[PDB]
Amino acid sequence: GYDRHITIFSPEGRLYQVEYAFKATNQTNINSLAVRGKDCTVVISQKKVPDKLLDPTTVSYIFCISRTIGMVVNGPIPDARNAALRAKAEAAEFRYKYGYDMPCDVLAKRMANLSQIYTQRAYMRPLGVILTFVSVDEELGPSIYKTDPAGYYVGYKATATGPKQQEITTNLENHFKKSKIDHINEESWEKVVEFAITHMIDALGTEFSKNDLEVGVATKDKFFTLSAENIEERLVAIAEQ
Amino acid sequence: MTDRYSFSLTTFSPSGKLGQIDYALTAVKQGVTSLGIKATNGVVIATEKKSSSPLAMSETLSKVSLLTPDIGAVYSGMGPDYRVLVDKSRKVAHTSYKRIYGEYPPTKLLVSEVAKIMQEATQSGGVRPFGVSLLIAGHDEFNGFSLYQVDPSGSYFPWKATAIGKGSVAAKTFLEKRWNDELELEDAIHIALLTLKESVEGEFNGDTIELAIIGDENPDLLGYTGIPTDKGPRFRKLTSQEINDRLEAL
Amino acid sequence: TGYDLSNSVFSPDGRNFQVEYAVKAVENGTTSIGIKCNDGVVFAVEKLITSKLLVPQKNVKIQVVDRHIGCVYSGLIPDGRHLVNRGREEAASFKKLYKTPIPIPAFADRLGQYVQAHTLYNSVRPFGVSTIFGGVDKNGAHLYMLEPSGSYWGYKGAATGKGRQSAKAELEKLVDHHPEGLSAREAVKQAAKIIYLAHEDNKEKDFELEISWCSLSETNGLHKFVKGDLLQEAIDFAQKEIN
Amino acid sequence: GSRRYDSRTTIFSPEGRLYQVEYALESISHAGTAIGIMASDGIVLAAERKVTSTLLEQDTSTEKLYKLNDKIAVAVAGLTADAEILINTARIHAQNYLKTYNEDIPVEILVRRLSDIKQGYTQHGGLRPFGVSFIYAGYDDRYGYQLYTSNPSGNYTGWKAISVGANTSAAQTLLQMDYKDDMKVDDAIELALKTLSKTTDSSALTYDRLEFATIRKGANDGEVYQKIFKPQEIKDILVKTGIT
Amino acid sequence: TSIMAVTFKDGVILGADSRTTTGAYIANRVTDKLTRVHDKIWCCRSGSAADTQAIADIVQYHLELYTSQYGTPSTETAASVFKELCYENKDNLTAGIIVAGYDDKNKGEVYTIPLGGSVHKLPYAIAGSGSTFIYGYCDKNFRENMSKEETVDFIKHSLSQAIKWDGSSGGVIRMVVLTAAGVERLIFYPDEYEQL
Amino acid sequence: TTIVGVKFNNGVVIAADTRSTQGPIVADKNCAKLHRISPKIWCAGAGTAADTEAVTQLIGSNIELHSLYTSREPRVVSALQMLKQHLFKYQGHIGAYLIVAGVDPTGSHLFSIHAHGSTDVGYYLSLGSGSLAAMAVLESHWKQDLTKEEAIKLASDAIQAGIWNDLGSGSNVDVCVMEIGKDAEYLRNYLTPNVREEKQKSYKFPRGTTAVLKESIVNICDIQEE
Amino acid sequence: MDIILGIRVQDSVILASSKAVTRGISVLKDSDDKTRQLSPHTLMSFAGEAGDTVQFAEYIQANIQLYSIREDYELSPQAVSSFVRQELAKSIRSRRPYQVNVLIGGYDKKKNKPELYQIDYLGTKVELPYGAHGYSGFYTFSLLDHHYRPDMTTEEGLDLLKLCVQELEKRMPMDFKGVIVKIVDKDGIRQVDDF
Amino acid sequence: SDPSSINGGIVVAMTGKDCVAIACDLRLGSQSLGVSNKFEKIFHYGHVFLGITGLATDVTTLNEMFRYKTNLYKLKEERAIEPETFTQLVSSSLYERRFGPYFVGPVVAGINSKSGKPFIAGFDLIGCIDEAKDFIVSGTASDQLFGMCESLYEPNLEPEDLFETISQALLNAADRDALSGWGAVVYIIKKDEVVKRYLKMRQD
Amino acid sequence: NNYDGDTVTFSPTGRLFQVEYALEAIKQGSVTVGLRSNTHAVLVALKRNADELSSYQKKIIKCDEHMGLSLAGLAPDARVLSNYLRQQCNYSSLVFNRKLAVERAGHLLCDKAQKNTQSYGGRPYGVGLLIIGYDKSGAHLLEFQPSGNVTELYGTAIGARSQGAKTYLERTLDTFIKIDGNPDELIKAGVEAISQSLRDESLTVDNLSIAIVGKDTPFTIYDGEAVAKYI
Ligand SMILES: [Cl-]
Ligand SMILES: [Mg+2]
Ligand SMILES: [Mg+2]
Ligand SMILES: [Mg+2]
Ligand SMILES: [Mg+2]
């Protein structure tokens, strides 16, 4: 039974190492969510600092890949940072060679191709991570593209990742079934972040303080993360209506 | 480090079976149904856009891909394996042909190059076979219209019409009754839609079906005028609306 | 089963058992700690005196990287040395290209990526050490702790080895009782105490205390070993607290 | 490390056999039968396509018979994809020889080269062997008309008449019975088709299940012509020989 | 070329002419020699146009990758990356580059990298063929901690003279101002600066 | 060789003469110097003629693959970046001097490139042996906010200056217009001001004028059946 | 080295090559054989730069002898000459090219015809009735153009060759110390020991 | 010293009504010394004809190279290569030796078997394609050939008239060049017959 | 058990069995002792013969004028490691005109041995070494294990029955450290130390091997009748 140790086919045409890499994805016990506005793309993720000895400012699963592209990761931090470093290198090289900023969907494809190689080549293991890339693309507008250990990727109107992804997914599905549009019809990114946090609270059934969340926002020509005090202002506005 | 898997991971078993190739074919069998039909004045290839989530934008996932202006491809099996093969197939069409002869390769030879890549993943060190079967449709001046199937082993066969994946056995029987050598392209599209409806459970419309043709030259899709001999690509992907129009006359 | 025989193999849980076995070697090692103070960091380690024939103060365990970073580790000592050698190469190339000395967070990732790379293939074994390291850069003091998996985070206080539970509890008290912060000289005294308290898990043999520090005010942001009178003062403070 | 997963494709059994070669030969025994017959005035190559379909485009299809150059052709039995790798190598070798010596490559030299490549995969590299057996039909001015076969071991031998693939034991007995040295091409055509007709696992032998080729000096004066038979031409020769 | 960078109270300003020559033919009279390698780190180029464009593109790539990992680089760091390329490839390059940038901690800084690949940190720097004619003028007229308006006049008058005497220099005078307030581009036409 | 590029209101136009030379001899009287990198990115080349086509096709090939990979229409800055880095690597030994123009989702663009890898940006550019004659016309008649009709007129006038005044240039004017939101129109032999006059005499010989030793049929057919 | 001549007659090929070897100031040897037997019915003479000539000739000899053993068959003169041309054509773009010119005289046993091939160091091959390298042709070709017939006997060929050598001994400034003459025909290769 | 004029020789090609013609001299020399009068410079791969002038070793090498490549082309494509496609193959093959080139001046001539259209093309040593409607010239007397062709040529000549025109163009050009002559060959090429004619000319 | 097939595999308790098996080879080897004062450092080694016709296997190797070691375990591995030390001592002298510090020599040996414990295909070294030397900080004694662990000591012993000599040195610690400026007495203490590890056999003239390095004493090895004085 060595067909379960390396990435070769089992008698059912399955790759067990790829399937087990998907299971490692939920080892951190963190849920993330991404949505699109008119002018922006917002990504939120749970933040858990279980040890008091930790410096909470260094605990993060959101990465600034390029000026325009942001990436949130679902999976262990070593594999997350591995993927982060590579994505940063790929984005920089792309700009140097082709003279324009690497699009979000193109980076997603590139990282997905790299993941595909690990499923075919035996000496390399899959990374136990799911990568959600966000930006406001200059051609396609607000964009969410998500990659997994199988080498699969696709665009999203909105998406969710983690142990409780299904609850969040169905919550988002129901909202877009009502509105009948592919985005959050809102002018400011502040209100789109408020939408994201509200619908995560509804889906998970839990309340959040300023230190329980982690937020990333993509606008035209920049991606940035919010501070604890920026999130607090967001939480106050939610509670006041 | 270094890749220390320099040995074959696909080997003959006592019964003469190449296990990994057989298992790759099993993966293809689980895959979503795709088909191809050849007409007198064109070829059609079609498949179902099995969306993994309704939040996913299935237009951003292309199951039918342009390889050259006159050659297209569709698959059944593992999507990621297909995507990288399309990248390699597009590049090899240039490096091993267009940069030498100043023209795009004929269908049979591009198929031959894709097959070679798939064969090598069946013998080279430290790799598994590709878990896909391809259907490649195309046209060239001297061979006319053609349709080819390529398997994980690297073997390829020309077809008048065929199907691969989930419901291929039933689909091939359906095609045998309907196919003749006097079909026009519109007739072949009609038969393709009829055949594909049998293997689809849920929604059946332009948004859940991906369909492309190899037909007449499209000067409107060339992007420039002024060179008489350049008349445009024969590959054309049908729009969501164009599919729905033909579903009313179904 | 058989998932634990080879490195980089995912178990049906999604776990790398070889990395988890490397942690066992870390847990078997001597206690080492790190304390983040107001303008710097302090490192301390327990050295077991296996015999009278060991020359006192000679078998130095704490290692310097560049001139501003200290590194201490628990587990397989040779593995730690190999990791520090790589760290010194990383810090050298950074300074070569960018002129400025490597920032601590930048340095943390360099070690992290290198340790993580030893979980990607079956041709290599994971590191049998957890490394506590840090120093002072342009943005202030930083303390990190890096595991066999390649996982690292920033810390207010950090501990590893056989007496890590005891040490962690002591560190948590300091964080609670000093929200405004701890001075460098206080941190040296406290580090001595915590190692002496953590020595209860290794009470069979007696030990030798070794301390180092980087502080903006006390050492000009350079890594230095605590020696002579300042070391004896910390030993006296530690001995007074256990009695 | 990696040793754990190595099949060791290039080792002897306790009996002194090469496991992988033996198992590759087992694979080839399930492939469609290919027959070669050598006459005084030419060579015949006949081969059976494996259980086909009515929707297979036959006139543009090739799975058995391949052209190596104008004078040499091969019949394939085994993995088609593996064969095409070797066939392209052989085509290049023939052209290398023609460029070097300005003379067409002698048939045996081409056969030896391909056979040596097969041998290498059994002795070094740790890769699986090619699951292919060839029948080589060719002509040169030294030995005239020649038939050879090679198998995954890299061993090759010459023949007056030979079969590879399925039912070779039965086919070889039938050829050994009716073959004579003074035989002509038109007689050899009939023998090849009659042999396939009796050994086939199909219910009946039809044009759509066959590939056929002749190498004749039936080319206008001292020169050699290769003829890969078309579907309609295979249908005619089946009626002529009285099989359909 | 005529290029210069000058530090002042609020930061630093880069200046340049716009003439590119193959021999006596002016191949481009409206060239932009002030080049951006980071938001507030720019450079001035002199020597082979191919070489300095290749170098600046590589530096921009290096600093973009630096920023993604370690945050905003210092001007000293940018100068070091320029130096590494110019020093290690001295046999095959003909490039004279002035690096200028604005930090909030370090404020305005100027580094000059001559042919050899050496680095020199200076209060102001001049380079290019036309700089030879204004060593005297610039040394006499430069003061530390000038205002924005004074620095613009110093550069305008300086490059005006360099253009007047050097046939290789000419066209418009381009300038780029680097302060806490942001990045401002300035342009001055012949009818303006010739009558100075 | 004379090649020019001129920006206008809603796009860009490039033009070229049609003479290619071997020293003082005219090798081809109707040469095609306007090359296609992609449907809406065209470039004109001067210098070593093999180098300008080779480098145009290589980058054009890689641009096509890049366009398929990214699912986006190619950009002129991508063609520019790939061309300059290729040419810099070969230190000027690939003697390609190019004017690159086109339209893409970003807008309309016009750049020149030189064999060593320098690039420049402009509203009007000229390259080749007739570049000084062409640039004289461009510096005399160029203005901001040219129309399409004005830009074609200016470009062809600049090439004519090269044709008549530069011995390296001659014959016809080729033009290619790339307008935003439209197909690029390639106007081969847009002007034909150099048709040869009828000769004074016919030089058709009587049949049997040439002395012949041997005649034979050449077998171009393959080896025959039967 | 210096003069190498070749002539193809009715039923044989005759190669003549000088005997002198000169090291600048002195003639070190006057009996040198500038030829190698490649196969029983194929002979190759050579001339060019010192060292390279013999090194090349022996290398070719070894290769043709290897082919003969492997196939148990003698290559045709045409096939041998093509192999030699390719080696020289490969050599001319090498780091340090072989500076060697050769004549290949062979009797084709299949066609029953003598054949003479002239190949220079660049890899320039021509089949000829008579040939030479260096300045040898300048003195001898006017005589060969006049007297040569395709139906000449071997004895007539040797007589025409004597007239060529006499003209060389009269008008050439260098003393090449006579020639060694060898005949290639259906019976193989033999040396004319009195010339 | 100049590799392109050591051996000498010329090639010319012309188009006519439903036909093409290609012709060459037969000389091979070592500078002043005439070595061979049977060195043909026109080769054919199927119905596509290739003339090659320049350094003779490269002429031989390239013929052997294009025979090699067109033979593999035919086996894989299952059809003979066409003039337009072959032209691109010559261009590609020459440019791959950009910084160590074959010293040659190739000329392609042929009729497309499907369209019936007459085709000719020329190259420099490094691959640049010159695809003229009227005529192509190459070799040590290319200047002379340009002069003859420019005055003698008219469009839409019948095969037997085209023969006279190209023959007179070659002969009179070769007689004004020291390194060309010693015989000549002319190919007249129609869609399914090719005639080859050796010309009688002065042998000095 | 299932985790001792190669050096690239940890056991479930975090052990490296191939390294532990390499450590076992040292315990089978013949006893060797090391000890030092403030002026000198001494090696004493019991050499082992194959039989009565055979020679006694050499145990001590010189690395430089100021440094050298004694071995216990696989002798060919000691040759590889001592050769590496010779080179490193030599690189230091040629490039930096500097005698290599004994502590730095230990660090180099540790790192060389470590690479063989973390990579596939290789194997750990099967030998233990006792390095003595005199540098700019006086006399030194090091103990090398093929796990990579190098330790600086006043005295030690490795090999079979080395525990007896190690206990003796632990008692005598305060006495032998004070033997300054008297080489003969320091060797006497080393010969008396190694005697606590002997059984059945005693120290003969071709059995005993002694080495010494000190303040004004280059690293020299004594064998044969040169050690009869100490028997
Ligand atoms: Cl990729
Ligand atoms: Mg894998
Ligand atoms: Mg001026
Ligand atoms: Mg003449
Ligand atoms: Mg003459």
Of E30, E158, E35, the C-alpha closest to E97 is E35
Tell me if there are at least 3 CB pairs under 8 Å linking chains A and H: no
Q: Which fold has domain B1-250?
A: Glutamine Phosphoribosylpyrophosphate, subunit 1, domain 1 (3.60.20)
Of I135, I132, I60, I131, the C-alpha closest to I93 is I135
H64 in D contact zone (CB under 8 Å): yes
DSSP letter assigned to residue I154: S
B109 in D contact zone (CB under 8 Å): no
Quote the tokens at residue F102: 């086109």
CA geometry: angle at C161 spanning C160 and C163, to 5°?
Answer: 95
Quote the tokens at residue F59: 């980058």
Q: Does domain I1-231 have CATH number 3.40.50.1820?
A: no
Contact assignment for D81 to B154 by CB distance below 8 Å: yes
Do F49 and H124 touch, CB atoms closer than 8 A?
yes
Do F1 and F16 touch, CB atoms closer than 8 A?
yes
Q: From ligand 2's centre to the CA of A77, what distance in Å?
A: 20
Where does chain E have alpha helices with state H? 49-70, 75-88, 135-141, 148-165, 190-193
Quote the tokens at residue C103: 């920032």
From chain F, pick out residues whose CB is under 8 angstroms from the CB of B227.
186, 188
Task: Determine the 3-state secondary structure of I89 from DSSP.
Answer: helix
CA geometry: angle at H129 spanning H128 and H134, to 5°?
Answer: 145
Distance CA A133, CA E135 (A): 53
Domain definitions of chain I by residue range: 1-231
- Which strand (E) or helix (H) includes residue E112? strand E108-113
- Which strand (E) or helix (H) includes residue A73? strand A70-74
F128 Cβ partners below 8 Å, 6+ apart?
Answer: F1, F2, F3, F46, F47, F97, F134, F162, F166, F168, F169
Do I152 and I103 touch, CB atoms closer than 8 A?
yes
Q: Which residue in H4, H38, H39, H60 has the most chain G C-beta atoms within 10 A of its own C-beta, making it the best mutation to test that interface?
A: H60
Neighbour count for residue B167 (Cβ, 10 Å): 18
Distance CA D167, CA D189 (A): 19
Quote the tokens at residue G31: 């009996």
Where does chain H have alpha helices with state H? 56-77, 83-95, 142-152, 159-174
DSSP string, E166-183: -TT--S-EEEEEEETTEE
The CB-side HSE value for F86 (13 A sphere, CA atoms) comes to 23
Map B17-77 to HEC letters: CEHHHHHHHHHHHHCCCEEEEECCCCEEEEEECCCCCCCEEHHHCCCCEEEECCEEEEEEE
Query: Which residue reads 């007995």 in tokens?
Result: D173
Nearest CB neighbour to I154, from listed C4, C53, C77: C53
CA A241 distance to own-chain centroid: 28
Tell me if there are at least 3 CB pairs under 8 Å linking chains I and A: no
CA geometry: angle at G76 spanning G73 and G78, to 5°?
Answer: 155
The CB-side HSE value for F100 (13 A sphere, CA atoms) comes to 31
Nearest CB neighbour to A89, from listed E57, E60, E65: E65
Question: Which CATH number, 3.60.20.10, 3.90.1300.10, 3.40.190.290, 2.40.50.140, labels domain D1-244?
Answer: 3.60.20.10
> Given CA atoms B138, B143, B149, B155 in this order, what sign does their dihedral have?
negative
Q: Which residue in A4, A25, A52, A53 has the most chain C C-beta atoms within 10 A of its own C-beta, making it the best mutation to test that interface?
A: A53
Residues listed for chain G:
195
F219 in D contact zone (CB under 8 Å): no
Pairing of strands E11-16, E20-22: unpaired
B6 in C contact zone (CB under 8 Å): no
Tell me if there are at least 3 CB pairs under 8 Å linking chains B and C: yes
Domain CATH for E136 = 3.60.20.10
Contact assignment for F225 to D218 by CB distance below 8 Å: yes
Question: Which CATH number, 3.40.50.2020, 3.60.20.10, 2.60.40.10, 3.40.50.150, labels domain A1-241?
Answer: 3.60.20.10
Q: What is the largest CA-CA distance in chain E?
A: 49
Q: In Å, how far are D33, D54, D232, E28, H172 from D236, measured between CA atoms? A: 21, 19, 6, 77, 59
H36 in G contact zone (CB under 8 Å): yes
Taking the CA atoms of residue B59, residue B63, residue B64 and residue B65 in that order, the dihedral angle to the nearest 10 degrees is: 90
Contact assignment for D1 to C5 by CB distance below 8 Å: no
Neighbour count for residue I104 (Cβ, 10 Å): 13
Query: Which residue reads 């290569």 in tokens?
Result: H81
Burial of H116 (C-beta count, 10 Å sphere; 0-12/13-18/19+): exposed
CA G146 distance to own-chain centroid: 22
Do C118 and C4 touch, CB atoms closer than 8 A?
no
Distance CA D96, CA E96 (A): 54
Pairing of strands G100-108, G113-119: antiparallel
Rounded to a whole number of angstroms, the CA Rg of chain I reads 18
Query: Counting ligands in written order, which one lies closest to the CA of residue H179?
Result: 4
DSSP string, I11-32: -TTS--HHHHHHHHHHHHSPPE
Bridge partners (DSSP) of residue F101 are F42, F110
Quote the tokens at residue E49: 């146009």
Distance CA F74, CA F41 (A): 8
> Given CA atoms B76, B79, B85, B87 in this order, what sign does their dihedral have?
positive
Where does chain D have alpha helices with state H? 19-28, 80-101, 107-123, 168-178, 185-199, 231-240
Q: Which residues of A, range 119-138, sit inside 8 Å of F by Cβ?
A: 138
Of C24, C123, C9, C77, the C-alpha closest to I10 is C24
H80 in D contact zone (CB under 8 Å): no
Distance CA G180, CA G159 (A): 14
H33 in G contact zone (CB under 8 Å): yes
Phi-psi map region of B3: left, alpha, beta (phi>0 left; psi -120 to 50 alpha): beta
From chain B, pick out residues whose CB is under 8 angstroms from the CB of C117.
1
Question: Which strand ranges, in their side-by-side order, compose the sheet holding B156-158?
Answer: B65-68, B71-77, B132-140, B144-150, B156-158
Do D182 and D155 touch, CB atoms closer than 8 A?
no
Q: From ligand 2's centre to the CA of B128, what distance in Å?
A: 9
Task: Determine the 3-state secondary structure of I3 from DSSP.
Answer: coil
Gap between the terminal Cα atoms of chain B: 59
Task: Determine the 3-state secondary structure of F68 from DSSP.
Answer: helix
Contact assignment for A96 to E57 by CB distance below 8 Å: yes
Q: Does domain C1-243 have CATH number 3.60.20.10?
A: yes
Quote the tokens at residue G60: 């070719």
> Which residues constitute the domain of residue E4?
1-196
Residue H143: φ, ψ to 5°: -55, -50
Domain definitions of chain A by residue range: 1-241
Number of domains in chain G: 1
Burial of C221 (C-beta count, 10 Å sphere; 0-12/13-18/19+): buried
D181 Cβ partners below 8 Å, 6+ apart?
Answer: D40, D160
D151 Cβ partners below 8 Å, 6+ apart?
Answer: D21, D25, D28, D118, D133, D164
Neighbour count for residue H198 (Cβ, 10 Å): 16
Distance CA A92, CA A88 (A): 6
Distance CA I145, CA I110 (A): 8
Of C44, C22, C23, the C-alpha closest to C143 is C44
Domains in chain F: ranges and CATH: 1-226 (3.60.20.10)
Neighbour count for residue I161 (Cβ, 10 Å): 17
Task: Determine the 3-state secondary structure of E25 from DSSP.
Answer: strand
Distance CA C172, CA C179 (A): 11
Map D92-104 to HEC letters: HHHHHHHHHHCCC
Distance CA A128, CA A17 (A): 10
Contact assignment for G79 to D103 by CB distance below 8 Å: yes
Residue E47: φ, ψ to 5°: 105, -150
Buried b (16+ CB within 10 A) or exposed e, G79-94: bbbbbbbbbbbebbee
Quote the tokens at residue F29: 């009287």
Do E51 and E73 touch, CB atoms closer than 8 A?
no
Pairing of strands F184-191, B224-225: parallel
Distance CA F172, CA E37 (A): 44
H167 in B contact zone (CB under 8 Å): no
DSSP letter assigned to residue D22: H
Question: Which strand ranges, in their side-by-side order, compose the sheet holding D72-78?
Answer: D65-67, D72-78, D132-140, D144-150, D156-158
Where does H101-157 have alpha helices with state H? 142-152
Structure's resolution in angstroms: 2.9
Bridge partners (DSSP) of residue H129 are H123
Q: In Å, how far are D51, F60, F135, F151, G136 from F96, measured between CA atoms? A: 58, 15, 20, 25, 47
Angle at which helices H83-95 and H56-77 cross, to 10°: 130
Question: Which CATH number, 3.30.565.10, 3.40.50.300, 2.60.40.1180, 3.60.20.10, labels domain H1-204?
Answer: 3.60.20.10
CA geometry: angle at I169 spanning I168 and I175, to 5°?
Answer: 110
DSSP string, G74-123: PPPHHHHHHHHHHHHHHHTTSSS---EEEEEEEEETTTTEEEEEEE-TT-
Distance CA H178, CA I13 (A): 92
* Residue F88 Cα, gap to closest chain E Cα (Å): 7
From chain H, pick out residues whose CB is under 8 angstroms from the CB of B106.
77
Distance CA B50, CA B53 (A): 9
CA geometry: angle at A162 spanning A161 and A163, to 5°?
Answer: 140
CA A138 distance to own-chain centroid: 20
Q: Is F106 a catalytic residue?
A: no
Rounded to a whole number of angstroms, the CA Rg of chain A reads 18
Pairing of strands F11-17, F173-179: antiparallel
Contact assignment for A76 to C151 by CB distance below 8 Å: yes
Of I10, I80, I34, I45, the C-alpha closest to I186 is I34
Chains that touch G (3 or more CB pairs under 8 A): D, H
Query: Counting ligands in written order, which one lies closest to the CA of residue H174?
Result: 4
